[PDB]
Amino acid sequence: AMVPNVVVTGLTLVCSSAPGPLELDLTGDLESFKKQSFVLKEGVEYRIKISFRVNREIVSGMKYIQHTYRKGVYIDYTDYMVGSYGPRAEEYEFLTPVEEAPKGMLARGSYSIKSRFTDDDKTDHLSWEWNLTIKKDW
Numbered sequence: 001a002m003v004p005n006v007v008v009t010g011l012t013l014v015c016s017s018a019p020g021p022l023e024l025d026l027t028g029d030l031e032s033f034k035k036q037s038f039v040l041k042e043g044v045e046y047r048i049k050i051s052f053r054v055n056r057e058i059v060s061g062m063k064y065i066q067h068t069y070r071k072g073v074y075i076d077y078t079d080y081m082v083g084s085y086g087p088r089a090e091e092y093e094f095l096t097p098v099e100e101a102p103k104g105m106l107a108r109g110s111y112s113i114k115s116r117f118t119d120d121d122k123t124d125h126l127s128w129e130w131n132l133t134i135k136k137d138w
Helices: 030-035
Strands: 006-014 023-025 038-041 045-054 059-070 073-085 092-095 109-118 126-135
Touching: 006 109, 006 126, 030 126, 045 059, 045 073, 073 092
Parallel strands: 038 126
Antiparallel strands: 006 023, 006 045, 045 092, 059 073, 059 109, 109 126
16 A cells, blocks of 8 residues: 555546547546536436546445536435445446436536545545536537
């Protein structure tokens, strides 16, 4: 240990209709993300791919948590059970089930997400904040 056991290395919005890549480098400057926003066109299916490495010891009950806010109102909580993961050379990938972005004048606009990748030791392997804007078009 000088290296954390679990290092969350990236976040990718998987959308087969997206024009450009939608990816966060989670090994950098986490605060610059709140200053930005990914634009997702309304009513597109997507998944969230989380990249992470395990470095020294097995970690059980890994879980991906998202808190969604809309202009400060708490609007949703979603989690995904990732499972148990051992130390390995290759980094790991987890994908969330398919979700849809909402539609309509009402639902369009900017969302604030607080993410946490945790496990049954309740370890903050990383927490980060990012923004999503739903537009009429890409």
